[PDB]
């Protein structure tokens, strides 16, 4: 077992706050914001040895990233940014930093009660997305 096993499973989005403003701050275009904001994704998290895989499945896009903690990788985001990503564990929280074009955003994933809580931060703007077990 690892502690990261707490994240493993299939999760469904049940609430989203301030996601449009987060996307605006990130630089997402109008039409993409509207369609992505409407999405109600499932997040599927799995672990196999040192490799963590996070999938997002929705009517908008199906994305998948696989990574090793602390080890940088190239990611193409759902809004088609090409970013350099590093994901680490900090006191039980998965911290995902994306860097592109001199900009940076941080996505934190944490377990709270029976929920998985995702905090998306771009400068001073924070969006909170809450998922429950599917
Ligand atoms: C449009 C961009 C900024 C975006 C889209 C999505 C989905 C709606 C595909 C997500 S997430 O996969 O729901 O966490 C996320 C997370 C990783 C913040 C970001």
Swiss-Prot record:
Identify the Pfam families for this entry.
Answer: Lipocalin
Query: Which is one Gene Ontology cellular component term of this protein?
Result: cytosol
- Could you tell me the keywords of this UniProt record? Acetylation, Cytoplasm, Lipid-binding, Nucleus, Phosphoprotein, Transport
Keyword Metal-binding attributed: no
> Which intervals of this chain are the motif Nuclear localization signal?
24-34
* Family annotation (InterPro entries): Calycin, Fatty_acid-bd, ILBP, Lipocln_cytosolic_FA-bd_dom
List, in alphabetical order, the GO biological process terms annotated in this UniProt record. Answer: brown fat cell differentiation; cellular response to lithium ion; cellular response to tumor necrosis factor; cholesterol homeostasis; fatty acid transport; long-chain fatty acid transport; negative regulation of DNA-templated transcription; positive regulation of cold-induced thermogenesis
The residues that hold a fatty acid are 129-131
Subunit and interaction comment: Monomer. Homodimer. Interacts with PPARG.
- What's noted about domains in the record? Forms a beta-barrel structure that accommodates hydrophobic ligands in its interior.
Its name, as the record gives it, is Fatty acid-binding protein, adipocyte
Q: What is the lineage of its organism?
A: Eukaryota, Metazoa, Chordata, Craniata, Vertebrata
Gene from which this protein is expressed: FABP4
């Amino acid at each position: 077992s690892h502690m990261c096993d707490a994240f493993v499973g299939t999760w469904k989005l049940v609430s989203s706050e301030n996601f449009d403003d987060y996307m605006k701050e990130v630089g997402v275009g109008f039409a993409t914001r509207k369609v992505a904001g409407m999405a109600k994704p499932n997040m599927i998290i799995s672990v196999n040895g040192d490799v963590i895989t996070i999938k997002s499945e929705s009517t908008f896009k199906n994305t998948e990233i696989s990574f090793i903690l602390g080890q940088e990788f190239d990611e193409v985001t759902a809004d088609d940014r090409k970013v350099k990503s590093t994901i680490t564990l900090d006191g039980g929280v998965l911290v995902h930093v994306q860097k592109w074009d001199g900009k940076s955003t941080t996505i934190k994933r944490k377990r709270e009660d029976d929920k998985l809580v995702v905090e998306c931060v771009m400068k001073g703007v924070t969006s909170t997305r809450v998922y429950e077990r599917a």
